[PDB]
From a paper:
Asparaginases (EC 3.5.1.1), which split L-asparagine to L-aspartate and ammonia, are grouped into three unrelated structural classes: Class 1 (bacterial-type), Class 2 (plant-type), and Class 3 ([name]-type). [name] is a homodimer with an α/β protomeric fold, formed by two tightly packed domains. The active site of the enzyme is located in a cleft on the protomer surface and marked by a zinc ion with an unusual coordination sphere created by Cys135, Lys138, Cys189, and a water molecule. The conspicuous catalytic center of the enzyme comprises two Ser-Lys tandems (Ser48-Lys51 and Ser80-Lys263), centered around the curiously hydrated Ser48 residue and located in the close vicinity of the metal binding site.
The introduction of alanine at position 139 resulted in only minor atomic shifts and structural rearrangements in the active site area, almost identical in the four protein chains. The substitution of His139 by alanine does not affect the conformation of the neighboring residues: just two water molecules, marking the sites of the two N atoms of the imidazole ring, fill the available space left by the histidine side chain, maintaining the original pattern of hydrogen bonds in the active site area. The fully occupied Zn2+ binding site is conserved in the mutant structure, as are the catalytic Ser-Lys tandems. Therefore, a water triad was modeled forming very strong H-bonds with the Ser48 Oγ atom, with O…O distances of 2.3–2.4 Å. Interestingly, the [name] mutant matches the WT form in kcat (445 s−1 vs. 416 s−1), but its substrate specificity is reduced more than twice (5.6 mM vs. 2.7 mM).
Author numbering:
A (entry chain A): 4 to 353
B (entry chain B): 4 to 352
């Protein structure tokens, strides 16, 4: 319950960060934990697959012809690379909308390399550049498809947001009153719920992929969840971008899992059934959710990668692709290694 | 104890950050605390006034003619503004040295506005651009004055670093073995010691300033501490830069205190004796030191400003120049405020 990731300088403690984590089975039963696995947590962008489900289940959205890469962008916190802007624009054209219809705003890119190119060009990002631009187009598409107004598609009382709110609570297996709502950076409602339920959503994503693969009689919702999983795993560069953790993680695993960042250092992973998950004592898919209490992203990726190693998910060779995130560099202005990162926590079985 | 600073989104907890703080008198006695006031803590750049004391006490350094603004730069984590870089180069000429003699490296500017300008220009920062460049020149100056060699002035076995290590321990009133050492971003040794002792250093700085102003006879060390305090308070723009917390804090207080940032979210302040310090129960100067356990700088500045308010240091008018740091903006991409910062901590005496 007192689980930390700790950085040091010469073996002297620099910073410490409290970790919360839940590892759950396909029905949401808690298998392993760090910290408080039920911590009430703002899922932020890690809720995007659930919002994408609400979009995909909206009557008429199928008629726009969104493809897997478009769905991956709905699920993205992308780096605002030119390819992400181009896909956003292509999605707007599918619904006969324009950039002025977006209700999210521009921001500095999540990628330092993109941001430096923008600074060099004096480029001011606009709505089409938002990391949430794919979700925004999807919400616009849903509003248009049912003949709702589009001007306020992001407002809490709009029917698209009522659909989102209902869909999030159903995927979490929670009553409406057990999900709290704030406003996100992109100006949409954003949910908070117990951390283990974030893992449950991702377990359900990977379980649906397994059941699609196995040729089971799936509900339309399970079919849609399987589609979302497949889309993210097939187009992981749309979900984040070059050099980004989510993209590198999903590329290394080549369809065995999906992963997604939430702002302020949450992370979620859906893991398809494998020899590794069977060794962990479950017969189906699993979900992992993590929150770093103080919000540090570098520590989040270090911890997530350490957790994958402790859980035996992947091979050493596969996980070696994430080495730069697992043990972040601590090299000073003269090339000297001054410190490191340590994981003095123990996963508890529960 | 459970002392935190917390951010929320619509009243829903986002992040929480553990706070440690010590408020000490001029002899280091603990008056108030948050968290663990004796946490072993890397002082990082908050140690720079102690390193500047080691430089200024090196025999021969007075002959180079460093002025108060040069001393303030020795005490700095500057933003690498053109005035900082230029002063570093001017300081090198005072000691007949070149940039190739420095043993620190460049890095992206601590100021976003400066760094944006560098990106637009394809500027590559070099040693004189380091936020620690003034300290580096001072260490090189002391090595030149000693006469034993300058190539390794930054190495632990060099007499300049032996002087630094002894001086830090003496100011903390610690045995050498109770101060631990790592290596800083600039490649110099950097000390760790209990957090309250960082407060003690800054209490001694302010106390020396009080004695000097009152005309008391002082030891050579106290006279040098008073000089460091004066230099920081007279040239706060050299200590950090435009828009930076340390500069805005020291300007607002107009000589009543000095403050300094350490990397990974430590902060130290030395407060000259005043009605406010007397209300806190001490008859001399005060020191304050703070560490945010997880290293978040935005939260550090919010907590330091909140602590000054709780201690009654300044006036609402003086502290209001720090309002942007006290309650950081939480405005989204559409201009809407989405939450804020709160301070569920409780000072203990
Ligand atoms: Cl594409
Ligand atoms: Zn968003
Ligand atoms: Zn330094």
């Amino acid at each position: 319950s007192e689980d930390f990731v700790v950085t040091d300088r010469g073996g002297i403690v620099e910073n410490s960060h409290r970790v919360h984590a839940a590892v759950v089975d396909a029905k949401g039963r808690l298998l392993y934990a760090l910290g408080n696995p039920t911590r009430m947590t703002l899922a932020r962008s890690a809720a995007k697959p659930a919002q994408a489900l609400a979009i995909l289940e909206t009557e008429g959205v199928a008629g726009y012809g969104f493809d897997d890469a478009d769905i991956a962008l709905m699920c993205a916190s992308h780096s605002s690379e030119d390819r992400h802007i181009a896909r956003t624009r292509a999605m707007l054209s599918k619904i006969k909308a324009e950039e002025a219809d977006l209700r999210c705003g521009g921001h500095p890119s999540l990628s330092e390399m993109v941001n430096r190119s923008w600074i060099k060009q004096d480029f001011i990002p606009t709505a089409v550049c938002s990391n949430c631009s794919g979700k925004a187009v999807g919400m616009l598409a849903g509003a248009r498809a049912i003949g709702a107004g589009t001007d306020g598609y992001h407002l809490p009382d709009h029917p698209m947001q009522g659909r989102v709110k209902r869909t999030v609570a159903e995927l979490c297996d929670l009553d409406a009153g057990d999900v709290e709502w704030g406003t996100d950076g992109c100006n949409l409602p954003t949910p908070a719920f117990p951390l283990d339920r974030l893992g449950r959503i991702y377990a359900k994503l990977a379980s649906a992929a397994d059941g699609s693969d196995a040729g089971e009689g799936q509900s339309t919702r399970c079919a849609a969840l399987a589609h979302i999983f497949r889309a993210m795993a097939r187009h992981p560069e749309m979900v984040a971008g070059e050099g980004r953790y989510c993209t590198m993680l999903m590329r290394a695993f080549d369809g065995a899992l999906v992963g997604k960042l939430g702002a302020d250092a949450s992370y979620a992973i859906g893991v398809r059934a494998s020899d590794a998950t069977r060794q962990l004592g479950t017969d189906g898919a699993l979900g992992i959710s993590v929150k770093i209490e103080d919000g540090n992203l570098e520590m989040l990726y270090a911890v997530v990668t350490e957790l994958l190693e402790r859980l035996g998910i992947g091979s050493p060779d596969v996980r070696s692709q994430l080495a730069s995130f697992h043990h972040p560099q601590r090299v000073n202005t003269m090339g000297v290694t001054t410190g490191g990162v340590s994981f003095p926590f123990k996963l508890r079985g529960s």
